[PDB]
Design a binder for this molecule. Structure first.
Ligand SMILES: O=C(c1c2ccccc2cc2ccccc12)N1CCC(N2CCC[C@@H](C(=O)N3CCOCC3)C2)CC1
Ligand SMILES: O=C(c1c2ccccc2cc2ccccc12)N1CCC(N2CCC[C@@H](C(=O)N3CCOCC3)C2)CC1
Lengths: 696, 696
């Protein structure tokens, strides 16, 4: 016992495994539920400081397999785990779910066989994933591992013999490995006969048992660990489409560990804990030369957070747990439950204060969440303090996060107007390599930002099941050689695929000072998914195939411009060339103005390509009710889908709207949401009555 | 008329549009059905040279919209198209479908408004896509366009007026654009009142109508073209998952044209025809300096074929049409029809001649299709002349193509053992750029090859609906800094997602001299999709978590090695150090051999991670019947799925197998396929009898 004379018992002595986990720079597995309790309690303090919490607000129950391999809840002492994988069922009362919400936490025990994955850990991880999926509840994975387990048939080590070419000269080589009769008998005696595959031959009177294959009695030596890794990789790929999956890299994640991080998509990486495939030491042995000095050069935050493999970084385990808990606050309690509404001091009924100007640089985050000013806080489009930005280390030209609109949680995609830089590191493995700094202008989709946009859309859709708003402001895709060669077309196409798959309301809004041109409009147009998408343009927004300079270059050429000079200039109507030179700069400005006059939201409304033209200051009030009306109609569309089996979305929606009182303006979002919420139980009775269904 | 005195009528004079298309270096739209007829006739000649074909073997009928916008077949003169998009319904008798197969060909008319996409071309393209999809038939798109159509309100051009700050000095600036009463009246007279949005003001006695927005009377000027582009982009994204989609880049594909190429995935690019977003001329104007000299620098084959955006290149239009027709020969006639069997002179019943050796370099294509030798042709795993390689210009470390196994079409993925190089071009837009040459060793998955593998899997699955064979031979993923930073984890994960989605039989086969290690096994293990996947290892294959050098380094260290010296060496059992130095190189070899003895297919069988260990020479005979048995059982599984609605795959398969005569060995593929094919109609009666179904 060390240290002596402490006020309370030495927890690292009662369970020496806690000390081992600590010695490896990570939280001991059994102490993670306590971190979730601390993080959950902080959520309450930040929400309503006056709330009196009691320990019954949070329950953690360890899940273990029974005799028939079925998961069951247990209350046992920490460190009793017979396998290197542990799980907990968490039931927490949160500000968004005051009566309780549930989730599962799976974790590697780094103190158990270095946190390696053997067949038993793989089958348990899979069982826990299926458990989460069956219930529709989130699956949190805490990664702290050495990858797939490795071994050798340790029983064959003291028994094997070598068929030397020349016994007196070992250096001269060997023919094969073999066992003797006494070697064979040793295996027979310990019931390990099938540990080797032998072939008997007689050499100079003595019978040799030529080892043809070594199998081993102990399970979890090789391929069986690789099979199990495959099983859990496929399980995670499926879980991502079904439930909310998130991973916290808590010590290091190797091989299958690294793949699991990616397959669950949403990842929080603790500073200094690497996500690696092959370690730096092993790589130097493969390369010959001592190339790398740390695993952080391969899988640190400097790699993974900059990549977008790590969505967020955390200073320590508790910060990571706090970020999981914060992220989950935007997510339904379970699959297909409504998005969790959480109204704060910042009500829907107010104008938007922060307004962008064409002559001034702005951070898009100011439009999203507002900004502090010497003269007071300028509120933005979304609820004050609700913006939770993710993928913040990668493709900084797009800003992705979760936010709340008068309490309604949603995914937000905004455009960074400021030029962004990123540094490609020099790989020590190549002596003829140097670090490159890449600049990328704002309001242009590059391969990385196109990938980030698609990624964000998919992550809001799967598991999170959130509605979305895109504050669309792109001049197009980068069509230059570098970006075309770097497959910008592929990444842009992922955006289309991501929108086709979206199952919740989408709002595309071209903001004030914003533009949506050529290829950028194509990839985000509401006809991609008419069931979910809707588009709005601000009165101060712009849109067209080309920018005014482009339109003029193709459609308002010199002959058209000179004819305009002939019409509008008294002097024009060699003495022409001198007036041409004088007039040309201002007539170029006239044609640019003529072109820009087509690019207005009024033309967008006239041509029916936008639902409405909006005023930014009034957008919060408009979108709050539009979204709230939309969530309600979508709820009723889903109920109707059960009650028929075969009807189109247009048919379902028209039927639901036929139920509204004749006095109800179908175009009034507030009136429509107010009537539905006043009649959920009445509409339910209407639906239960429609159960006069027998259709072939 | 030019030229005079030709033997037959001058087709470029009868229809001057044919000459226009030719002048732009492309085939005239109406002449494309003839290219499909020529290509189809060549298919027959290559299959059975003696076949007598008559014109009734090929039928092309143009599709146009009727009064109610419904597609109908027409026989009209070429060049009569009122829109810049044309379509044809093709009915061809091919070697794999001698009674006929159908498909639709959509194409831009480059002679109609420069092949630009206006709202009418967009609605027609979408209508044709839906037509193809409803019928399950392939959709071939021939791209020859200038992207979305652009325009201005040409009626406002001679009418507009400028509110000069100082009329005598135009250079001093202007306030706004306006119309006069006579300008307003001109619009009123021609029923174009809504061409502008005006606001009347009186300035110095004269009434000015301030132009606030220009709308225009003509449709297809801007945003409406962008909306239509969005519609067709989403339509193509959906079509790719539903039917066989392919695109031939026949002149140039701009903006939406480029996106359509990618969204349909499978693309054949004719040499010298660019896939661009923004042209070189427009880019130089944006950049200031004359940076690019050709659109080929942005979207030529040197970019797109090297990228994997273009799956194949073609020397001319007919070569492209020939490649479409060849690709389609592996594809079912329509969605959910069986894969087209095509037996050739190369029967299933033969050994595999080409065998790889560890001491010699080989091209994996020799294992796939065989190779010519001075002593005769050495047959490979698949049918002679059946290997159709695609994505051949990109990530050359993986070899992807379609092939036939005793007539059975399937997708093949093989590993290039030879080191591959690729040149990243220097972008002229950046003066501080130089071309980089990247070497990548064989049997290692890099970001590009991981992406290509996933891409291939998805392209075999969607629309092609083919079974697949992966001749798995990877040592792992590249875990170095460069590849980790270039998101190898993301690309590797796409492989898992692609396998989870696979709906046809998969065979994973570790070939002779081949290995499957660590991360490479994980990503391809059959537990990822047990309903479709199966794994086999050759008797001369190897597999383990690490390579023997790695296993020794972690599990057969110096203390274990010295104990072995103590046991096996008479002299060992400072005088120790000298013997240690002598023994160490050979004892390192012993431990490497000990480790390798675990890596055998016998351990894989023993541990139940492979279905069987195989002999390469006998693989063709084995796989032919395994695949044929599998296709049959899968057919019966689908029929049963209709007749119940709710039963697991394990339940369905066990039930189908309960129908086999008691004498039938369920493990005998040939006997199982022979019995099913002898009883399809009997099993059908059994299924029709199971239609005593009323389950709640
Ligand atoms: O409207 C024009 C256009 C001009 C725009 C600005 C100045 C001069 C122009 C000249 C043009 C001449 C003819 C057609 C279009 C023109 N476009 C051409 C450029 C298009 N881009 C959209 C955003 C990405 C841009 C791009 O590809 N880049 C710019 C940044 O990265 C390198 C390459 C180009 C936008 C449409
Ligand atoms: O088995 C070993 C291993 C050794 C292999 C060969 C020589 C020396 C080794 C030393 C090792 C020491 C400790 C663990 C594993 C070792 N592995 C470590 C390397 C693993 N790679 C699989 C294929 C890709 C390889 C890789 O990441 N590269 C190689 C090519 O590109 C750059 C980086 C490494 C394979 C597993």
């Amino acid at each position: 016992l060390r240290p002596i004379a402490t006020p309370y018992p030495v927890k690292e002595w009662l369970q020496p495994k806690r000390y081992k986990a600590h010695l490896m720079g990570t939280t001991y597995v059994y102490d993670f539920p306590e971190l979730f309790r601390q993080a959950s309690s902080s959520q309450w303090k930040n929400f309503s400081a006056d709330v009196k919490l009691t320990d019954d607000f949070f329950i953690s129950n360890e899940l273990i397999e029974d005799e028939n391999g079925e998961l069951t809840e247990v209350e046992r002492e920490p460190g009793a785990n017979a396998i290197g994988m542990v799980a907990f069922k968490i039931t927490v009362k949160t500000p968004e779910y005051p009566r309780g919400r549930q989730f599962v936490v799976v974790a590697n025990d780094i103190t158990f066989k270095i946190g390696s994955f053997g067949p038993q850990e793989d089958e348990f991880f899979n069982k826990v994933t299926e458990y989460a999926r069956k219930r529709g509840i989130p699956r949190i994975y805490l990664a702290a591992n050495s990858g797939a387990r490795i071994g050798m048939a340790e029983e064959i080590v003291p028994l094997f013999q070598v068929a030397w070419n020349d016994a007196a000269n070992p250096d001269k080589g060997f023919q094969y490995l073999y066992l003797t009769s006494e070697g064979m008998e040793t295996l027979k005696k310990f019931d390990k006969e099938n540990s080797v595959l032998t072939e008997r031959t007689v050499i100079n009177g003595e019978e040799r048992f030529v080892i043809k294959t070594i199998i081993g009695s102990e399970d979890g030596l090789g391929v069986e660990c690789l099979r199990g890794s495959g099983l859990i990789a496929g399980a995670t790929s499926r879980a991502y489409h079904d439930i909310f999956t998130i991973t916290l890299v808590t010590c290091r994640s190797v091989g299958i560990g690294a793949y699991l991080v990616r397959l669950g998509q949403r990842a929080i990486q603790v500073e200094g804990q690497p996500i690696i495939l092959t370690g730096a030491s092993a790589l130097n042995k493969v390369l010959g030369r001592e190339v790398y000095t740390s695993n952080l050069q391969l899988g640190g935050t400097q790699i993974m957070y900059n990549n977008g493999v790590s969505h967020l970084t955390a200073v320590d385990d508790l910060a990571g747990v706090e970020k999981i808990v914060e992220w989950m606050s935007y997510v339904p309690a379970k699959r297909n439950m409504p998005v969790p509404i959480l109204e704060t001091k910042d009500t829907w009924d107010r104008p938007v204060d922060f307004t962008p100007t064409n002559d001034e640089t702005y951070d898009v985050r100011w439009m999203i969440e507002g900004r502090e000013t010497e003269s007071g806080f300028e509120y933005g489009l979304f609820d004050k303090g609700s913006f939770f930005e993710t993928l913040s280390g990668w493709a900084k030209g797009v800003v992705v996060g979760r936010a709340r609109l008068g309490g309604i949680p949603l995914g937000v995609i905004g455009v960074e107007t400021r030029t962004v830089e990123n540094l490609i590191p020099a790989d020590p493995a190549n002596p003829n390599s140097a670090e490159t700094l890449i600049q990328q202008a704002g309001q242009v989709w590059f391969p990385n930002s196109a990938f980030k946009t698609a990624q964000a859309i998919n992550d809001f859709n799967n598991g999170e099941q959130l509605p979305m708003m895109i504050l669309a402001n792109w001049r197009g895709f980068s069509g230059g050689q570098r970006d075309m060669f770097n497959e910008v077309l592929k990444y842009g196409s992922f955006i289309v695929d991501a929108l086709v798959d979206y199952k919740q309301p989408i709002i595309i809004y071209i903001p004030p000072t914003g533009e949506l041109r050529g290829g950028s409009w194509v990839v985000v147009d509401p006809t991609i998914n008419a069931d979910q998408m809707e588009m709005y343009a601000d009165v101060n927004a712009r849109a067209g195939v080309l920018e005014p300079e482009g339109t003029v270059e193709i459609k308002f050429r010199r002959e058209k411009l000179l004819d305009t000079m002939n019409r509008l200039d008294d002097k024009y109507r060699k003495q022409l060339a001198d007036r041409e030179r004088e007039l040309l700069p201002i007539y170029g400005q006239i044609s640019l103005q003529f072109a820009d006059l087509h690019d207005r939201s009024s033309r967008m409304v006239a041509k029916g390509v936008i639902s409405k033209e909006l005023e930014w200051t009034e957008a919060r009030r408009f979108f709050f009710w539009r979204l709230r009306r939309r969530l309600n109609e979508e709820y009723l569309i889903k109920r109707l889908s059960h009650q028929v089996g075969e009807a189109s979305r247009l048919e379902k929606i028209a039927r639901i709207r036929s139920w509204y009182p004749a006095s109800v303006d179908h175009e009034d979002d507030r009136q429509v949401a107010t009537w539905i919420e006043e009649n959920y139980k009445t509409l339910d009775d209407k639906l239960k009555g429609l159960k006069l269904e027998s259709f072939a």
